[PDB]
Amino acid sequence: RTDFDLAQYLQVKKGVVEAALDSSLAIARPEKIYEAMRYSLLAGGKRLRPILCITACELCGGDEALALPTACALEMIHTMSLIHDDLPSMDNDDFRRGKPTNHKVYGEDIAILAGDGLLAYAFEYVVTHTPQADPQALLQVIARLGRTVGAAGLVGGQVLDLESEGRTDITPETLTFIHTHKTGALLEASVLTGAILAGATGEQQQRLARYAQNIGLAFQVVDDILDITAAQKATYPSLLGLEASRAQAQSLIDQAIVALEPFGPSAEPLQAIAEYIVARKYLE
Amino acid sequence: TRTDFDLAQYLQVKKGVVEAALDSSLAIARPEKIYEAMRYSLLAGGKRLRPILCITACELCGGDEALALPTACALEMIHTMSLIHDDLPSMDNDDFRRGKPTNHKVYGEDIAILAGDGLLAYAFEYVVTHTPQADPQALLQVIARLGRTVGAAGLVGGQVLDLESEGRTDITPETLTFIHTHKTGALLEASVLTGAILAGATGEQQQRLARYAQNIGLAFQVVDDILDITATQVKAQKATYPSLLGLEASRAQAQSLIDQAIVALEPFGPSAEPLQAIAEYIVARKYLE
Numbered sequence A: 001r002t003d004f005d006l007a008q009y010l011q012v013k014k015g016v017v018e019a020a021l022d023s024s025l026a027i028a029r030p031e032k033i034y035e036a037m038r039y040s041l042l043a044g045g046k047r048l049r050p051i052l053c054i055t056a057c058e059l060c061g062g063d064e065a066l067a068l069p070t071a072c073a074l075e076m077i078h079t080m081s082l083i084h085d086d087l088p089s090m091d092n093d094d095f096r097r098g099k100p101t102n103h104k105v106y107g108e109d110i111a112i113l114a115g116d117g118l119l120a121y122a123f124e125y126v127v128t129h130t131p132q133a134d135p136q137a138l139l140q141v142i143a144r145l146g147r148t149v150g151a152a153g154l155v156g157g158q159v160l161d162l163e164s165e166g167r168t169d170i171t172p173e174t175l176t177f178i179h180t181h182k183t184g185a186l187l188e189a190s191v192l193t194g195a196i197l198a199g200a201t202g203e204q205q206q207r208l209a210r211y212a213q214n215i216g217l218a219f220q221v222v223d224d225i226l227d228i229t230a231a232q233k234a235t236y237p238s239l240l241g242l243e244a245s246r247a248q249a250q251s252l253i254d255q256a257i258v259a260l261e262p263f264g265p266s267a268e269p270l271q272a273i274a275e276y277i278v279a280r281k282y283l284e
Numbered sequence B: 001t002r003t004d005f006d007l008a009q010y011l012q013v014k015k016g017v018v019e020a021a022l023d024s025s026l027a028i029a030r031p032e033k034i035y036e037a038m039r040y041s042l043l044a045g046g047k048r049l050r051p052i053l054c055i056t057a058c059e060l061c062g063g064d065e066a067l068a069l070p071t072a073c074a075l076e077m078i079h080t081m082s083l084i085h086d087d088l089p090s091m092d093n094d095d096f097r098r099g100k101p102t103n104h105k106v107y108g109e110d111i112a113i114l115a116g117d118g119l120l121a122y123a124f125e126y127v128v129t130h131t132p133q134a135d136p137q138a139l140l141q142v143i144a145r146l147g148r149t150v151g152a153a154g155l156v157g158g159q160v161l162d163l164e165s166e167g168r169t170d171i172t173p174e175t176l177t178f179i180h181t182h183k184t185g186a187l188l189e190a191s192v193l194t195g196a197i198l199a200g201a202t203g204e205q206q207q208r209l210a211r212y213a214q215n216i217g218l219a220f221q222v223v224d225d226i227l228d229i230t231a232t233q234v235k236a237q238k239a240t241y242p243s244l245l246g247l248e249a250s251r252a253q254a255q256s257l258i259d260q261a262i263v264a265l266e267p268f269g270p271s272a273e274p275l276q277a278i279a280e281y282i283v284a285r286k287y288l289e
């Protein structure tokens, strides 16, 4: 075919990622921990973070093989965060995409440890499967992954989100601060790790970071819009009204697209992903 | 200065260096609660065996303290994560550790689970960002070893094997040893091997250090079980080396494991004497405590 089809592009990359994730975990003793890690890792989904990593690597001159281990690591980290967020002590979710959550199948103890095991394996996998990377670039990827997961990123975001519950002084700025930690850090790491592996310049990385921060926040504003149009927490529409929230969501997507224009037409897949994820949220 | 090597003083000085570096590694920032909760568990004290082993093995292989100290701190962050997660109500359900409330009893189970996750992430970040002078290929080999050590083939696998064993009626010495090599041995082996890798130790040298670490790890667990059963001279049923083998066979096993750890390091020459002395000292201190 001659026509670029984003849905086909994403389906093909998703299949590459899912085959690598499945091969990454062979069952060994104790079988239950491998079963529990595979249960959540191989549950499916959009695989947005690994796809962003591979796509940003290719944008910057790299290839799928260079990015694929880091892409898998980002999905292991994403999966850990979902297992830990679903637990009874946090969101207390019995289902995820209409299937029982990890702790409901394997128990809370094994779910906690499966999350820990996926985070550990993320780091091991990046190193052992990327011998062709420049060693200093690969260490930069490790440092970025560790900073992204921890108290200054995803885990800090989870704590700021818990602290916001049932407060009367939440502002759009403080909601944005929660989201930039809880989701933005890992979306930024997804594009920046692929860029770093490919040797992208600082200037190129800054454009990719603006793209990632903008799409991440747009996704959260659109989630809030759909929730309100369908434990007390303020949301963008409850703080700003629906008119201003819809305008903000559109502005953030437009800003993400503009951020990548200076790469040229090579940026068109990343630019299209911004609008596609939003359009799919309105259809689902 | 003094001229006479004093093992108790050596360990006190290294513990002080590690504790000062652990405290500096966690500067409180937003959200303050996560830093507070990580520090509550990380800075609670203890023997700091793992970081001390790392520094000592790095120096044995010709490295310096500055080369090892960040990895040494990362090993203690990993150890601390494992204690926080182990104490939780879904696992060992412990209300107290080292005389004080456990992390979840102070901050809530949610914050304790996240503090453990924060410490594991920071272990990997800290090794890279605070070891810029290391050979990059050696530092990548440290990261790979730490990832393998923590995960399902090591520490977390061991935690699952230990939880699976709880209340079972069919425990054998083979079953206990399989739990201990994963839950305890993997991280003690990583403590000496990461120090050795940083210093550029050969494969042959690393194999001797790994035998030392596996032997001491198991010996320390057999000695703990000996002390538990001789102190005894609803409570859950839990088989131990002496309940399965008898006290005579358990004592002989613990002595053989320490003798084998010492012999394992003899080929390094007299530079290995501090590591060799740590094996016997930790055991002697257990009998005195």
Ligand SMILES: [Cl-]
Pocket: A241, A242, A243, A244
């Ligand atoms: Cl409105």
Ligand SMILES: [Cl-]
Pocket: B205, B267, B268
């Ligand atoms: Cl030698």
Ligand SMILES: [Mg+2]
Pocket: A220, A223, A224, A235
């Ligand atoms: Mg929301």
Ligand SMILES: [Mg+2]
Pocket: A261, A264, A265, A267, A268
């Ligand atoms: Mg364009």
Ligand SMILES: [Mg+2]
Pocket: B266, B269, B270, B273
């Ligand atoms: Mg000797």
